[PDB]
Amino acid sequence: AFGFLQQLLRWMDISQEFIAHLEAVVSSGRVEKSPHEQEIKFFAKILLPLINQYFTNHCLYFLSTPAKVLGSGGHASNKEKEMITSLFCKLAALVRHRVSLFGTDAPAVVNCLHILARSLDARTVMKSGPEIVKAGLRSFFESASEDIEKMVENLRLGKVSKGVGQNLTYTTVALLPVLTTLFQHIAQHQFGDDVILDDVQVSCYRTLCSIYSLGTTKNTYVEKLRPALGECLARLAAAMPVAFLEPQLNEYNACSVYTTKSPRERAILGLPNSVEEMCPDIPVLDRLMADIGGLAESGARYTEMPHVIEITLPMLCSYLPRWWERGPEAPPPALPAGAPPPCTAVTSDHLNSLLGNILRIIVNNLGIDEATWMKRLAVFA
Amino acid sequence: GVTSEEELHLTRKLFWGIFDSLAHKKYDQELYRMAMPCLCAIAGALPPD
Secondary structure, eight states, rough: OOHHHHHHHHHHHOOOOOOOOHHHHHHOOOOOOOHHHHHHHHHIIIIIHHHHHHHTTTHHHHHHHHHHOOOSOOOOOOOHHHHHHHHHHHHHHHHTTOOOGGGHHHHHHHHHHHHHHOOOHHHOOOOOOOOHHHHHHHHHOOOHHHHHHHHHHIIISSSSOOHHHHHHIIIIIIIIIHHHHHHHHHHHOHHHHHHSSHHHHHHHHHHHHHHHTTTTTOOHHHHHHHHHHHHHHHHHHHHHOOOTGGGGGGGGGGSSSSHSSSSSSEEEEEOSSSSSSTTTTSSOOHHHHHHHHHHHHHHHGGGGGGHHHIIOOOOHHHHHHHHSSSTTSOOOOOOOOOOOOOOOOHHHHHHHHHHHHHHHHHHHTTOOOSSSHHHHHHOOO | OOOOSHHHHHHHHHHHHHHHHHSSSSOHHHHHHHHHHHHHHHHHHSSOO
């Protein structure tokens, strides 16, 4: 695996060499010689299917650790975990804003990104890893946040919807499905408290800030993008180590930038000086629950609340279960570690209240002719 | 039974022999169509470690 991964990384710098040539010729100086035609075909037709199947079979080998072995036997070394992380980052940057240049090979690239994401032991890499490898993973989240911010501001009809077309097709086809898979992978393996710590949190906050900002937007593009945005936001909530819906209790959360970093810092990098101001347009948990309850009892149909059903509800359906285990009413093994008060106030009442509202929402739209959101809501609840 | 540490050596050479040769062969659709499954099968048999 070490030699196989090293060759794959060797082809990654080769891949970056001819895509720039393709970008150059597609911009100026058209020429169909294609000096790297052999390299392009080998990368697309051999490497991508090989990466797709190799890491599908040996997914448990790379996710295994000496503390906890998942596969039949053996576990990847730290260097192997570092290389597979750099492979994901280089491949993601390769396809960034170049989905069209891959032609029919773009579905192959994103499928490799999905499988590489499911085989990322990011806990070990971020804890004990080289700065270069860690900086690559941080740059991926930062780049993802910037692309989503450009996407949402274009969905705000700042542009009719140049680079707007490239950014829009890259995010909805490559960035969003991959980011959803990566967050789901982090949530399943409890990597949130180890990966999203200092600058990933800032990147994840901006992604959380921007995605929810579609509530005050009414367009045709936004209507078809809600299922993708909602699923991505739900996975982010499961992996987010901070209770962004309960900023009043953030002082008791160890995995927060406002506790890990000094007040002297957090000013060299732009931060709003208060946890409540990170995403101020997100209603607090108490407010959010009241709004859903009011809509459910009012008998409102799906047409007058598409944002809540497609985005807000999946967020709460994933936020509450995560923080029910870390707050009051949890089954606490906290005889030694019970001194810090819980950073959340989620109890079984919140989950019970939300479930009752969801059931009332469904029956309000029980007899309508078309509702494709019911199947998506069922799996989230 | 299990491999005898010599079949794995043959399998490892078989993988890199095809991989290196295919990396320099000019693109042939027929060759690539059946060489790729061979590499995937070989890679899926060798232990990663």
